Write an enzyme that holds these catalytic residues in place. Structure first.
Site, PDB file in Angstrom:
ATOM      1  CG  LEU A 140      -5.656   3.235  -9.548  1.00  0.00           C
ATOM      2  CD1 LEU A 140      -5.829   2.547  -8.110  1.00  0.00           C
ATOM      3  CD2 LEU A 140      -5.569   4.762  -9.461  1.00  0.00           C
ATOM      4  CB  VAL A 173      -3.713  -1.793  -9.409  1.00  0.00           C
ATOM      5  CG1 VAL A 173      -4.402  -1.237  -8.111  1.00  0.00           C
ATOM      6  CG2 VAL A 173      -2.713  -2.868  -8.865  1.00  0.00           C
ATOM      7  CB  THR A 206      -7.045  -2.503  -1.188  1.00  0.00           C
ATOM      8  OG1 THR A 206      -6.686  -1.844  -2.281  1.00  0.00           O
ATOM      9  CG2 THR A 206      -6.476  -3.961  -1.033  1.00  0.00           C
ATOM     10  CG  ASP A 220       8.568  -5.088  -0.215  1.00  0.00           C
ATOM     11  OD1 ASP A 220       9.259  -4.262  -0.145  1.00  0.00           O
ATOM     12  OD2 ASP A 220       8.104  -5.455  -1.415  1.00  0.00           O
ATOM     13  NE  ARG A 253       9.665  -1.350  -2.937  1.00  0.00           N
ATOM     14  CZ  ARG A 253      10.441  -0.989  -1.972  1.00  0.00           C
ATOM     15  NH1 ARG A 253      11.195  -0.081  -2.125  1.00  0.00           N
ATOM     16  NH2 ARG A 253      10.947  -2.255  -1.401  1.00  0.00           N
ATOM     17  CG  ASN A 254       5.366  -1.583  -1.074  1.00  0.00           C
ATOM     18  OD1 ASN A 254       4.601  -1.339  -2.025  1.00  0.00           O
ATOM     19  ND2 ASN A 254       6.427  -2.366  -0.825  1.00  0.00           N
ATOM     20  CG  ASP A 266       0.608  -3.249  -1.407  1.00  0.00           C
ATOM     21  OD1 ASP A 266      -0.355  -3.675  -1.983  1.00  0.00           O
ATOM     22  OD2 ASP A 266       1.149  -1.981  -1.554  1.00  0.00           O
ATOM     23  CG  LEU A 326      -0.484  -8.310  -0.443  1.00  0.00           C
ATOM     24  CD1 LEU A 326      -1.054  -7.339  -1.380  1.00  0.00           C
ATOM     25  CD2 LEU A 326      -1.452  -9.714  -0.306  1.00  0.00           C
TER      26      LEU A 326
END
Ligand SMILES: Cc1c(-c2cc(Nc3cc4n(n3)CCN(C)C4)c(=O)[nH]n2)ccc(F)c1NC(=O)c1cc2ccccc2s1
Length: 265
Positions: A15, A23, A81, A128, A132-133, A146, A149
């Site tokens: 990934l 990942v 996850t 964060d 993108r997250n 995330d 983290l």
């Protein structure tokens, strides 16, 4: 913390790579889709993470990408996850930008706001938050990924506010100046995320460097209203960017605001 037996994991696809390394997509017990972070040696404060990981796993909400469990009896450690077939929201927005209706964009904001209201209620900071997250599943539901983290990253370019990887464009003045994180710094980032959604994945403050962004937002510069955002929607994202943290709304208030706009449409 749920210590998952690595024998129960089957790797299937790569990934890509992130702050902690590779990942993979895989299955747990031959049935359930999962994502597996293989934590690169030296990339994470591992003892600190292990000591604190249970708090993260106890976070459970439909709009949070679940942290199911960990594998820590060998190295590299694994974080297991919830798998999300459509990948990160940033790329999803960019790849489908000629297919979205504005109603869908507002629903994405709602999804994220629900997750963040839940984290707020648990006094848990993302640190964060950005497109993108966030991840998108096969049915187009957006979920926050995330969370928390950021704390465990070992990379000075990311942890220093003048580092080239620090998320300056998602950070309020008190983070850039004092490293003062709170749910109110997550609020600021959420406003930027709303802007990313309504701009269909444009980079915030494109053409400005990180330091120019910091300098100018400290002086009052704010992201312009994206074409697809109504004034009502823009008012919501703009409320996240009050210079003073205590003037910013809570995620509960933001959710109410978003729902009000939905009920009106
Ligand atoms: C979340 C993730 C996935 C990922 C991708 C998924 N789904 C998909 C599905 C597709 N892709 N990704 C890409 C390829 N597509 C064709 C389908 C998924 O379900 N879970 N995780 C893949 C590569 C990554 F690099 C990341 N992100 C990270 O590991 C990190 C983010 C942060 C943020 C702050 C601090 C530390 C870190 S570490």
């Amino acid at each position: 913390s749920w210590e998952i037996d690595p024998k129960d994991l089957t790797f299937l696809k790569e990934l890509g790579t992130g702050q902690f390394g590779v990942v993979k997509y895989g299955k747990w017990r031959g049935q359930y889709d999962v994502a597996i972070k293989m934590i690169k040696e030296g990339s994470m404060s591992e003892d600190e993470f292990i000591e604190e990981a249970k708090v993260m796993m106890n976070l459970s909400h439909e709009k949070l990408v679940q942290l199911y469990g960990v594998c820590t009896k060998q190295r590299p450690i694994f974080i297991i996850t919830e798998y999300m077939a459509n990948g990160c929201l940033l790329n999803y927005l960019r790849e489908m930008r000629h297919r979205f209706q504005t109603q869908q964009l507002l629903e994405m904001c709602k999804d994220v706001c629900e997750a963040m209201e839940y984290l707020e209620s648990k006094q848990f900071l993302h640190r964060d938050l950005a497109a993108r997250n966030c991840l998108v599943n096969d049915q187009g539901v957006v979920k926050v990924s995330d969370f928390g983290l950021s704390r465990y990253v070992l990379d000075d370019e990311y942890t220093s506010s003048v580092g080239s990887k620090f998320p300056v464009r998602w950070s309020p003045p008190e983070v850039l100046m004092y490293s003062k994180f709170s749910s109110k710094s997550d609020i600021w980032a959420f406003g930027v995320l709303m802007w990313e959604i309504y701009s269909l994945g444009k980079m915030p403050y494109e053409r400005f460097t990180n330091s120019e962004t910091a300098e100018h937002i400290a002086q009052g510069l704010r992201l312009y209203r994206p074409h697809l955002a109504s004034e009502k929607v823009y008012t919501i994202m703009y409320s996240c960017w009050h210079e003073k943290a205590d003037e910013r709304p809570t995620f509960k208030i933001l959710l109410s605001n978003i729902l009000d706009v939905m009920d009106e449409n």
